[PDB]
């Protein structure tokens, strides 16, 4: 890497909906990540929260009782 | 009519009719052929005249192969005299031993009688042939 | 991908040398050793050989090289050989290869 012209890329800390990624090793140490998926909310480590498909599921249910 | 699309040059030198030979000559597509005995520039309009003689001869039926093609441009002057070349106005150059035409999928008396009519439309002497061992395999 | 940058660079530099028509002082250098071979083209022939490999010496591949260059001079100058041109092959004139060259004086030279 040519000497001049460069971000620092110095060891860091960092945060999320989870705890830390000690890994870091980036420019601009100590950053705040809004939420990740990995660390397993939101997709990975499937939460499947709020979950859909209820549209065929419902109309066949409220229907024949009424 | 019969004629190329796309020529690279519009007009081209006459050249010789020499040394009757070279390619075609072995009856590759069909049952009987019409082979050329003499050299000639045969014209896009004599070719079509032979074709239609034959297709008219059998019931729109049979199958016809042609197998010479008019890519050589033929110029003529107007009744002027001498300045520039040109103009217009197409031929296939045909030496001895060539198979033009060559019908197939018809009866012997048919093919042979069509090819005889077809031959009358040509400027040269012709020969009707059948097909051979000699016409190989390839 | 045919005929690599190595063998273009190779050929390019070689042919230029070969035109001037001196004897060729030709340099192979591997990761481990560095060899140098003085050639007369048109007789298709090597005349004066010198390796680190055959002089069985080691450490600091550059300082090894100045040595296999001094080795060549002493060896070569002994056959009458003085003027030649430096082949340098597919190698930047630098470091190890520069060093063998600036060790190939006390004889030889203009390099």
């Amino acid at each position: 890497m040519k000497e001049g012209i460069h971000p620092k890329l110095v060891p860091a800390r960092i945060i999320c909906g989870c705890g830390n990624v000690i890994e870091t090793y980036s420019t601009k140490p100590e950053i705040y990540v809004e939420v990740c998926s990995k660390c397993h909310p939101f997709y990975t480590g499937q939460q499947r929260f709020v979950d859909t498909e209820g549209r065929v599921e419902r109309f066949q249910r409220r229907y024949g009782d009424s | 009519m019969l004629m190329p699309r796309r020529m690279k040059y519009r007009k081209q030198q006459r050249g010789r009719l020499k040394g009757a030979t070279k390619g075609g000559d072995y009856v590759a597509f069909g049952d009987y052929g019409l082979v050329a005995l003499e050299p000639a520039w045969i014209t896009a309009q004599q070719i079509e005249a032979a074709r239609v003689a034959m297709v008219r001869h059998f019931r729109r039926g049979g199958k016809i192969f042609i197998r010479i093609f008019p890519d050589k441009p033929y110029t003529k002057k107007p009744l002027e005299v001498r300045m520039g070349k040109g103009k217009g106005n197409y031929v296939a150059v045909v030496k001895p031993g060539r198979v033009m035409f060559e019908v197939a999928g018809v009866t012997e008396e048919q093919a042979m009688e069509a090819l005889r009519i077809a031959g009358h439309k040509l400027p040269i002497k012709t020969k009707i042939v059948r097909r051979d061992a000699y016409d190989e395999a390839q | 991908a045919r005929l690599t940058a190595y063998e273009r660079r190779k050929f390019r530099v070689r042919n230029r040398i070969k035109r001037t028509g001196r004897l060729r002082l030709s340099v192979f250098r591997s990761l481990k050793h560095i060899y140098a071979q003085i050639i007369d083209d048109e007789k298709g022939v090597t005349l004066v050989s010198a390796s680190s490999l055959a002089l069985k010496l080691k450490g600091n591949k550059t300082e090894v090289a100045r040595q296999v260059g001094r080795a060549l001079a002493e060896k070569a100058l002994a056959l009458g050989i003085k003027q030649v041109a430096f082949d340098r092959g597919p190698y930047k004139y630098h470091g190890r290869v520069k060093a063998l060259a600036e060790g190939a004086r006390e004889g030889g030279l203009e390099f």
């Binding site: - | 300045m83 520039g84 040109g86 103009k87 | 048109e42």
Partner: protein
């Protein structure tokens, strides 16, 4: 234009070719080949001029060499 004649030019023959052949005695400076591309490459004792013209560099005899895919080559052999 088209008919009357739009044609009618050509350019002077450039009189290009080999001007000395194999086993032919030459002097330094004689030119051996006149040519458009690198059609013959210069060999031993042979220069190229800016127009790809091959000349003897030394007196000698001229030998022709066909190095196959390396081209053809003209050299002058001394005993000059």
């Amino acid at each position: 234009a088209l008919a009357s004649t739009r044609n009618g030019r050509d350019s002077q023959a450039k009189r290009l070719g080999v001007k000395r052949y194999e086993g032919q005695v030459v002097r330094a400076g004689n030119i051996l080949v006149r040519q458009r591309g690198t059609r013959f490459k210069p060999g031993k004792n042979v220069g190229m001029g800016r127009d790809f013209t091959l000349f003897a560099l030394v007196d000698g005899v001229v030998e022709f060499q066909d190095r196959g895919r390396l081209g053809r080559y003209v050299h002058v052999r001394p005993l000059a």
